[PDB]
Amino acid sequence: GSAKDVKFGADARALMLQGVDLLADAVAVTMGPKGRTVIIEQSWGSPKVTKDGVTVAKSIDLKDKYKNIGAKLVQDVANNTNEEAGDGTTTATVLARSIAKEGFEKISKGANPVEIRRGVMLAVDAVIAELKKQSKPVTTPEEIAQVATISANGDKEIGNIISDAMKKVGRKGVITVKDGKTLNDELEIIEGMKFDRGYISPYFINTSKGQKCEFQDAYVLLSEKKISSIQSIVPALEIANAHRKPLVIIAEDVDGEALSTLVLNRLKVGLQVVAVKAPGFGDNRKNQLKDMAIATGGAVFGEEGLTLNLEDVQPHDLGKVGKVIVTKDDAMLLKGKGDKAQIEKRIQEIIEQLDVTTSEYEKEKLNERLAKLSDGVAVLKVGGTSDVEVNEKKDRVTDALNATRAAVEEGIVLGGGCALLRCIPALDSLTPANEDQKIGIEIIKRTLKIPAMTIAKNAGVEGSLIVEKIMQSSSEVGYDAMAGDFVNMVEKGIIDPTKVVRTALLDAAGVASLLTTAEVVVTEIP
Amino acid sequence: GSAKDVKFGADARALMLQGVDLLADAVAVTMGPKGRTVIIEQSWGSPKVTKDGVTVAKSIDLKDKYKNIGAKLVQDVANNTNEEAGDGTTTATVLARSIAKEGFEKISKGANPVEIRRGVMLAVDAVIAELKKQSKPVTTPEEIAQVATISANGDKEIGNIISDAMKKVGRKGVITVKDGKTLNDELEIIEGMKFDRGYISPYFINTSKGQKCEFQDAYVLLSEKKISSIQSIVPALEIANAHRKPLVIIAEDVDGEALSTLVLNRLKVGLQVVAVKAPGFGDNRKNQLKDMAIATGGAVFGEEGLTLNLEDVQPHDLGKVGKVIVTKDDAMLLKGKGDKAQIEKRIQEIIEQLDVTTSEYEKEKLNERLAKLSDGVAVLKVGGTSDVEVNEKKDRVTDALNATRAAVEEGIVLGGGCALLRCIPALDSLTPANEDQKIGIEIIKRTLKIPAMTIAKNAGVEGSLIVEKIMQSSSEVGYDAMAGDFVNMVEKGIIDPTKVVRTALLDAAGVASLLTTAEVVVTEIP
Amino acid sequence: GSAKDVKFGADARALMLQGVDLLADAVAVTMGPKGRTVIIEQSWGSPKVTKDGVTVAKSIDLKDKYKNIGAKLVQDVANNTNEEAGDGTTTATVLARSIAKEGFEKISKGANPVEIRRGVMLAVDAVIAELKKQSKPVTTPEEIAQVATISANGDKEIGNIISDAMKKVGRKGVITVKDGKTLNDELEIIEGMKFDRGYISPYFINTSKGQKCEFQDAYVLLSEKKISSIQSIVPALEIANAHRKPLVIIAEDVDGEALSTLVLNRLKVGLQVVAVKAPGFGDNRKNQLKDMAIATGGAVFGEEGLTLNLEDVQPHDLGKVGKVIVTKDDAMLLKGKGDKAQIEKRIQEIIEQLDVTTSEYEKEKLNERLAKLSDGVAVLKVGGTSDVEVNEKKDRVTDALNATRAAVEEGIVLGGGCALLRCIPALDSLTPANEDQKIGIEIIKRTLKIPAMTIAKNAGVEGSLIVEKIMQSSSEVGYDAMAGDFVNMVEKGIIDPTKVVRTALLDAAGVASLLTTAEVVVTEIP
Ligand SMILES: Nc1ncnc2c1ncn2[C@@H]1O[C@H](COP(=O)(O)OP(=O)(O)O)[C@@H](O)[C@H]1O
Ligand SMILES: Nc1ncnc2c1ncn2[C@@H]1O[C@H](COP(=O)(O)OP(=O)(O)O)[C@@H](O)[C@H]1O
Ligand SMILES: Nc1ncnc2c1ncn2[C@@H]1O[C@H](COP(=O)(O)OP(=O)(O)O)[C@@H](O)[C@H]1O
Ligand SMILES: [Mg+2]
Ligand SMILES: [Mg+2]
Ligand SMILES: [Mg+2]
Structure with missing residues (x-):
């Protein structure tokens, strides 16, 4: 050699x-x-x-x-x-x-x-x-703020904000840390299933205030393939208009004649539908649609293996959600109903994946916040006047976060x-x-x-x-x-x-x- | 490492x-x-x-x-x-x-x-x-010229011209800065709906002076699809020759048999038609055409939300209009009617967005210049005797511009x-x-x-x-x-x-x- | 960096x-x-x-x-x-x-x-x-020769020849400068329509002295497509024999049976026809043949858009020229009749083309010289005994030319x-x-x-x-x-x-x- x-x-x-x-x-x-x-x-x-x-x-x-x-x-x-x-x-x-x-x-x-x-x-x-x-072992949530503030090098506001997030999301809930554009720290809390995709057409908007489409007690349709044909779209609308519930449709894309049916039935006879693109990253979107399927209770259409076709739907093949909010940029689904055993099974599956497989392709975490969002998740938007400052502060915040989790889990x-x-x-x-x-x-x-x-x-x-x-x-x-x-x-x-x-x-x-x-x-x- | x-x-x-x-x-x-x-x-x-x-x-x-x-x-x-x-x-x-x-x-x-x-x-x-x-907070437009002139290193003519542009387009209107070919500064103001596309064929020419299409009290046609086809063009021309008004048509492209009808039939008892390519570039062109639509007040053709087909037009179609001037490079529209609910809808949309995707996506302003173009936009053509001089002066002008905007928006x-x-x-x-x-x-x-x-x-x-x-x-x-x-x-x-x-x-x-x-x-x- | x-x-x-x-x-x-x-x-x-x-x-x-x-x-x-x-x-x-x-x-x-x-x-x-x-401001044509001679570093022959060109082409006409092989400067002035293409067949020769085909008061036929077939060529010859005038034919090529008709009717019943190839490049040929169309008065056949077919010609669709001379190598057309307004329109078009034309392709000038001929352009063939001499001298003459134009245009x-x-x-x-x-x-x-x-x-x-x-x-x-x-x-x-x-x-x-x-x-x- x-x-x-x-x-x-x-x-x-x-x-x-x-x-x-x-x-x-x-x-x-x-x-x-x-x-x-x-x-x-x-x-x-x-x-x-x-x-x-x-x-x-x-x-x-x-x-x-x-x-x-x-x-x-x-x-x-x-x-x-x-x-x-x-x-x-x-x-x-x-x-x-x-x-x-x-x-x-x-x-x-x-x-x-x-x-x-x-x-x-x-x-x-x-x-x-x-x-x-x-x-x-830790007891009072003052001790949380103490461990956080000491691990954050004496910044009390850090351990305060961490204490607040940990209270409002739970001690073993999901907290994540990211750059602010703001000069100050922010705590944002999301509940639901949020992802960064918006309505395909403006015409779906109902509230005019915020320009959102807002629905409650809604159905969900999940398609792994594109839906261009009328043939596979129509029964899903007849079944939705049947039981007088709003329908949200998540798909690889919704276009051709299908979108035409949606925005004709939307602008005329005031039907309550929205269509949004799948979260969309090749093989990742498959896993995401499987997540939303399992969370909202119901099944994904198109090709996995067993193929369920869009023409033959039943109400037990859709999805059911407490509330839905959609904008041009993002979509949030709230209080979706499904087997809690089966969803916690899912979270236990993704965590047991991630732990043996820590690539720098951290979308596996982007999954975990989503399917855990029916407890909640906290986003920690760290501020500062310059990128190097934010990277320092964020290093300290991540340190304090890990320290608090170690504290709650061991002592x-x-x-x-x-x-x-x-x-x-x-x-x-x-x-x-x-x-x-x-x-x-x-x-x-x-x-x-x-x-x-x-x-x-x-x-x-x-x-x-x-x-x-x-x-x-x-x-x-x-x-x-x-x-x-x-x-x-x-x-x-x-x-x-x-x-x-x-x-x-x-x-x-x-x-x-x-x-x-x-x-x-x-x-x-x- | x-x-x-x-x-x-x-x-x-x-x-x-x-x-x-x-x-x-x-x-x-x-x-x-x-x-x-x-x-x-x-x-x-x-x-x-x-x-x-x-x-x-x-x-x-x-x-x-x-x-x-x-x-x-x-x-x-x-x-x-x-x-x-x-x-x-x-x-x-x-x-x-x-x-x-x-x-x-x-x-x-x-x-x-x-x-x-x-x-x-x-x-x-x-x-x-x-x-x-x-x-x-700033009040008199003398103060504008003052902050501009000081930020421009004592060049009074700069802050004068900036004051003039800011008066004639508004304090939160669009001002942009570019090289002159002239040895002196110029303020140009564009009014209307300006965009960078020029005819399709030369045979359209009407004034011979400048080689422009200059039209007044005209019709406007809006097509999201190409217009290459048989009989989808004709009713729009028959209806135009009916009310003896000129028609400009904006489309993804106009060519095949349609263009053949347009010319040679333009070269006949001087009726005025012009056709121009859509502002274009994929998914952007739809938003632009809806902008021009709403501005001239209504307009839809091509594939759909609500479907309007080109064969079925009516004399009230689709929006109107005022005057038009187009050249080899660019096209301008001027006196669009009705309207202001939807433009305020637009500003309400831009003000509420961009906050998400906040990190490079300024095209929302490229929208704002367009839909606000019926107030105006200003081009600052800076002069000078040499390119390096021009870059210096333009640096100073951009400084003074940003300074004036900071002054009006904060104090x-x-x-x-x-x-x-x-x-x-x-x-x-x-x-x-x-x-x-x-x-x-x-x-x-x-x-x-x-x-x-x-x-x-x-x-x-x-x-x-x-x-x-x-x-x-x-x-x-x-x-x-x-x-x-x-x-x-x-x-x-x-x-x-x-x-x-x-x-x-x-x-x-x-x-x-x-x-x-x-x-x-x-x-x-x- | x-x-x-x-x-x-x-x-x-x-x-x-x-x-x-x-x-x-x-x-x-x-x-x-x-x-x-x-x-x-x-x-x-x-x-x-x-x-x-x-x-x-x-x-x-x-x-x-x-x-x-x-x-x-x-x-x-x-x-x-x-x-x-x-x-x-x-x-x-x-x-x-x-x-x-x-x-x-x-x-x-x-x-x-x-x-x-x-x-x-x-x-x-x-x-x-x-x-x-x-x-x-300049007045006498002695002053031009003075400005030229002084800007050319005292060479009187330069300012003389420049004065001659400026007289014979006009003060804002086209003068261009290029290398001679002669040891002395020469002024050539071109007027007409010159291009480097010759008769397809020797049988077309008319003069026997020089081996040229020489015609006067002739017609011209312009075909953007090849002419192989009979049925497209024959009416164009019947119309020529009707009005007892010689016919020049310019085409992408003329061959097959068409050429056979041409040199049969040429050799047996002394009909006055010649056929020559298009000036030849690809897309350039269209602009050249349409140029010759506009100059000689008349229209180009073959497909542009509106297609005029060779089977249906009228005498007002041809071309009309004072004289024509053709050889094996080159073709010259002289005193062609058409709308002078429309031709000046054409030259105004090409200059406004070339001037904004970030181009290493100078053929636009080769076009411009042609459509300017019979108004005229002057070529300045500079002499000398060696390339370096020719280049220095050409630098000086170009200087004197630019100087004379600056003098006439400003003072x-x-x-x-x-x-x-x-x-x-x-x-x-x-x-x-x-x-x-x-x-x-x-x-x-x-x-x-x-x-x-x-x-x-x-x-x-x-x-x-x-x-x-x-x-x-x-x-x-x-x-x-x-x-x-x-x-x-x-x-x-x-x-x-x-x-x-x-x-x-x-x-x-x-x-x-x-x-x-x-x-x-x-x-x-x-
Ligand atoms: N006010 C304080 N007085 C005494 N020790 C402190 C104080 N604040 C923090 N520490 C100690 O500093 C240590 C943390 O080190 P730190 O600088 O955060 O780097 P790291 O956590 O990577 O070791 C802890 O062991 C803690 O006991
Ligand atoms: N005539 C003046 N008298 C006093 N201060 C001036 C004068 N003109 C400009 N200034 C000051 O110069 C500063 C602007 O600096 P400048 O040269 O524009 O660089 P920059 O703005 O990039 O820091 C301002 O704070 C302003 O107060
Ligand atoms: N016989 C002369 N007497 C005085 N000045 C002259 C004479 N000939 C030329 N000049 C001057 O020479 C100058 C031109 O310089 P030249 O050598 O042509 O280079 P350039 O034109 O690039 O400056 C002109 O300003 C002109 O006045
Ligand atoms: Mg630490
Ligand atoms: Mg400054
Ligand atoms: Mg000189």
């Missing part, structure tokens, strides 16, 4: 550690309320600004291939943490560096770094256990970094099998102090003193680095989801303890 | 600040009446000359990647301001530099630049509030830079939460002085003397830098639209305050 | 001025009777020699990007002048340099170069006014450069609004002296002595630099069209006064 070059022992360890230390030093300035931002040059556009640890970590590759090995491993931990939890990234990085340094330093001739790894892993299990003991524990600090006594009551494992437990025991010392150090104060003042102090009290003084932690609102504290530490130790086992590294020649 | 290189703290800040300062220094020479032009090399052609801050800013990228980061952020400011307001670009640039410098200088170890950002943004909100209090406030200067006392009555925010408010307090000091500095005078002379002076008085002495501002005509002053400041502070938060910069290696 | 580099103030100004001065110094050696030529290397061929200012200016681009900016602006001046007037190019360049230098030098800190520009433009308006006052004024010198007192009676404008008027006042001093300097004499001596002298007298002494200008024939003198100065001052406004220059890095 390709010509290569290899390096041996503490020399190579010192190089890899140089890389780790560089990347860690770059990410770690972002940590905490007094933390600071990192600008990253973009190849094509104006540069990114961020406070996100993982996005800083991913941005840094290095010319020196060994230092690049270290860097790649630490960004691996930060990425794993971001994927598994969505916050706590800088924390995972500084933890990983601490384990890597303290690991590397203790290696000698007689030492057995694999066994030391076993010891640190023992220490991590023992720590997360005590963390779970410390966890107190909350003390903020600052105190939650890890309180786990040290649990390590003190361990029973190491040998010197190596004891070294591992010592490594983790030192490493737990780090996040608080870093958050304090960013504040401009004597962080490692502050850590010790915290340790002499009671369990409920910690250091408010923004206010610059000690406080009850949970009372003052400084709290972290347990899931994030668990995952950051677990990933960081998981990769770094493996890194410390290295004795020889092999790299490509420039 | 690509190999990268990172830099830490006030060093990287000093580099980025070098970039900011370079670009700002380049932009700032253009500012005010005594400002000066910037030549920019073009790759293919002869070089640009400009006084436009944003066009100077976009032209400058830098080899040093950090300085280039600063530069790119400043271009973000100037571009955002130009997009959102269309003037005030140089102002936004010098403001952004001032906030960036004064920001960077005040950071230390104990400082919290994000919180300083919060203080700055507080200060900007507090300032724009007082700006809105200061705003006095006017004091020129010079005094409007920002008067907002300082509003900052003096603020209640900062902490030292960081106080630093921010101080930053804005200093930065507000900048535009006035810069306009004076370009004059060759002691700008910061003049700033303080203005501050000691009364609210109504400021510095006329062209005349070189103090005057009543509003009386002398030196006034700025409030929209431009708010948007420049908001964007500049918005990006620069984010820039000051940086602690680490990451860039690609050369 | 692309990495760039910027420069500030008089430093950058001195570089741009270096470029301007280089290009100007190169062009200016060509000026006047004692001026000299410039050789320009061609990439592919043997080098150009020229006395044309604009062609020198366009040839010079510069490595130093700033100097190249200056260079691009001055060649912009020379190109604008050549496009707008066709002579006076060197003059426009030296004027532009003078305005640029005198502009740049007068700039300081307190100065306002845009306002200085305003003063300059004021001065130029004031100058061209007095120029128009000085203008005396003539004093040569030498005296006409501007006489305009200086008009500057003396101006009322400047401020110091800047006064600087501008002073700049123009100095620049006006330049062209005469340059023409004198090229002579090898003390140009600025000569300028002041002419200024001390009376209005009618100036300096004959070729004869080397003072003379009455108009009497000795040294005169310049007013259009060229106005346009050169107006363009030069127009861009240079803009150049002087620059404070910052931005250029791409090598």
Whole structure:
């Protein structure tokens, strides 16, 4: 293969550690309320600004291939943490560096770094256990706003808006985040099944106020194929006019003579019909029409396999909806009736798809908001006066959102970094099998102090003193680095989801303890 | 990814600040009446000359990647301001530099630049509030010519011609700007229903002078389909020859046997017919033809909503009409009857839409020019002796136009830079939460002085003397830098639209305050 | 975008001025009777020699990007002048340099170069006014030959031959210029209808001397389609034998049985017919045959739309010509009768075509020459012993032609450069609004002296002595630099069209006064 070059022992360890230390030093300035931002040059556009640890970590590759090995491993931990939890990234990085340094330093001739790894892993299990003991599940929706506002770097309006959306959509409902054009944040809430397609003809309009077509207690007709012929359209209208209900028709397109029947029967003898194009993306629209079919109760016409033809309809083949609103741009359907078991089956299906298949073709999420919209969904239109600002704020909002979900689903524990600090006594009551494992437990025991010392150090104060003042102090009290003084932690609102504290530490130790086992590294020649 | 290189703290800040300062220094020479032009090399052609801050800013990228980061952020400011307001670009640039410098200088170890950002943004909100209090909405059309003339760098003829066009088409009517072939400026006004399509055959000609079709009290025919067919044309001509009136026919195309009837039968006892292609281009042409339909009052043929066929016409068909003039390139219709419910329906439609698809789809204005063309539209044919001159003058005219629109839609406030200067006392009555925010408010307090000091500095005078002379002076008085002495501002005509002053400041502070938060910069290696 | 580099103030100004001065110094050696030529290397061929200012200016681009900016602006001046007037190019360049230098030098800190520009433009308006006052419209056809001979650098034979062409074709008729193979210039004048197509068969020959078919008082038949069949051709011959006239037939082709009828009736009962191919391209042929239709009076057969078929002809559907001569290679038709109004309509149509016709396809002129014949066009076959000679000379004759047309259409004024010198007192009676404008008027006042001093300097004499001596002298007298002494200008024939003198100065001052406004220059890095 390709010509290569290899390096041996503490020399190579010192190089890899140089890389780790560089990347860690770059990410770690972002940590905490007094933390600071990192600008990253973009190849094509104006540069990114961020406070996100993982996005800083991913941005840094290095010319020196060994230092690049270290860097790649630490960004691996930060990425794993971001994927598994969505916050706590800088924390995972500084933890990983601490384990890597303290690991590397203790290696000698007689030492057995694999066994030391076993010891640190023992220490991590023992720590997360005590963390779970410390966890107190969220209750009041004030705590939601607290976790959100702290995860959003002290922006109270963010955690307020998140609390509102989570109240009005539910704690495990769908919230999504997107760019505003407005200079301020907006919470929009959609209920129903909205999609971005409008009436084919203006003539369908009934209200003249807003220029909408508004219907209630309506029927739905779903066609996967185009409907140009009269032959397949007419029975669907006779059946609709029969039971005196309005009919909405969703199709790949509605045109030829069919549209002529629709807008003649519409303008004359005042029939209540609308026709709108299918949401429309090739094979995607098929899945969407299947979604709306299942939600509104009823079936899709045209070619799947079993073909149901448009000429032979029955009232049980249509759809039934509480309300419908359509405009030139978009269509919303509301309170559609169908089997709730079967629709939750559908949502369970799409989620179980998406989770094993995370492409950057995220229309699978666009499905999930739609079929879940009969509880509701919240859109978070983030503001700001410039794109880079909105990207920063949106990074923070997504962080706070993921943090709140982790909080509701697992629990909350003390903020600052105190939650890890309180786990040290649990390590003190361990029973190491040998010197190596004891070294591992010592490594983790030192490493737990780090996040608080870093958050304090960013504040401009004597962080490692502050850590010790915290340790002499009671369990409920910690250091408010923004206010610059000690406080009850949970009372003052400084709290972290347990899931994030668990995952950051677990990933960081998981990769770094493996890194410390290295004795020889092999790299490509420039 | 690509190999990268990172830099830490006030060093990287000093580099980025070098970039900011370079670009700002380049932009700032253009500012005010005594400002000066910037030549920019073009790759293919002869070089640009400009006084436009944003066009100077976009032209400058830098080899040093950090300085280039600063530069790119400043271009973000100037571009955002130009997009959102269309003037005030140089102002936004010098403001952004001032906030960036004064920001960077005040950071230390104990400082919290994000919180300083919060203080700055507080200060900007507090300032724009007082700006809105200061705003006095435009009334006399002398004020229009004043804001135009100041935004056009003292060219009175520009603001005169803009005032004339805005009078003759209305303050929210359509004005557009284009190159003359003439050495002087011209105002042309189009009235009617103008669109860019010319005959189909030459044999139609009636006046021989200009080679136009000039018709009066004519008929109009509207066909969404091609008219190539046998006997679908004839009743429309028999009915036209009946009431001895000329007919213009607009269609997707007119050709085959139809055209053969039209000519040669045009060349017979001078009855007047003309045929022209529909304004066209796919799905747009339907909306355009419905526009001309509703304007002349009713009109439908071709395939359908409600179906009207071309064989069955009546003398009241389909809309009417007044006068018509068409040439080889373009067609104009004039005196359409009845109508105004549907046009107000149209403005009600455009005002309610575009808000969705808000991110590039300005064709809604292309609609608005058409359906409002029975009031008018203005073309601004700018003159000059050379293309580069023409591009300069046109840049200035477009600036003055956007400025006049911002003035009519939001308000006017004091020129010079005094409007920002008067907002300082509003900052003096603020209640900062902490030292960081106080630093921010101080930053804005200093930065507000900048535009006035810069306009004076370009004059060759002691700008910061003049700033303080203005501050000691009364609210109504400021510095006329062209005349070189103090005057009543509003009386002398030196006034700025409030929209431009708010948007420049908001964007500049918005990006620069984010820039000051940086602690680490990451860039690609050369 | 692309990495760039910027420069500030008089430093950058001195570089741009270096470029301007280089290009100007190169062009200016060509000026006047004692001026000299410039050789320009061609990439592919043997080098150009020229006395044309604009062609020198366009040839010079510069490595130093700033100097190249200056260079691009001055060649912009020379190109604008050549496009707008066709002579006076060197003059426009030296004027532009003078305005640029005198502009740049007068700039300081307190100065306002845009306002200085305003003063300059004021001065130029004031100058061209007095120029128009000085203008005396051309009368005698001696004056045309004078303007031509002076614009052709003293070649009397050029202005003689141009005078002859202008007499024999008219003052606004068509003269064109092209290479001879003869070593001397020749004037050919074409009138009639010439095109390069010959008899299909030798049997058509009538003269036996030259082998031509010569006809008079003939008919012409025009067929856009092929003529193979008998039944379409025969009535056209019966109608010809009826009225005992010769028949010329022009067609896409004439062959099959038709041709057999033609040369049978030709060879056995000496009928007077010839048949010739259409001038031939594809779509061009339609316009050519319809041209010949319109010229000869009559109509084209075959399919346009309304189709007239060859079976149904009438004598008023043919064509009628004073004379016809045909050979193996070419066909000439003479004194064709038709509506002169309709033919002038046709020429008015083709000129209005070609003028807006962004075309490398010059056949529109090849059309225009044809339909203009028997009104006439003159071709100027320029001689010389070598291609480079022919091209230089052709440049000069084209200059003289454009100059004569400018003279007839606007006027003539004093040569030498005296006409501007006489305009200086008009500057003396101006009322400047401020110091800047006064600087501008002073700049123009100095620049006006330049062209005469340059023409004198090229002579090898003390140009600025000569300028002041002419200024001390009376209005009618100036300096004959070729004869080397003072003379009455108009009497000795040294005169310049007013259009060229106005346009050169107006363009030069127009861009240079803009150049002087620059404070910052931005250029791409090598
Ligand atoms: N006022 C505060 N006092 C003490 N610690 C805080 C305060 N606000 C936030 N923190 C701590 O900051 C940490 C969050 O780090 P952050 O900068 O959001 O990056 P990440 O979440 O990716 O680690 C949490 O562990 C939290 O305990
Ligand atoms: N005669 C004048 N006296 C004082 N200030 C002026 C005068 N003319 C224009 N200004 C000021 O110049 C500013 C406009 O700057 P300009 O050169 O148009 O660049 P931009 O508008 O792109 O920032 C306005 O704020 C206005 O107050
Ligand atoms: N015999 C002459 N005496 C004085 N001036 C002359 C004479 N011949 C030509 N000129 C001047 O030369 C100028 C023309 O310059 P020329 O060399 O033709 O290049 P261009 O026409 O491109 O400027 C005219 O202004 C004319 O007055
Ligand atoms: Mg976070
Ligand atoms: Mg401006
Ligand atoms: Mg000449």
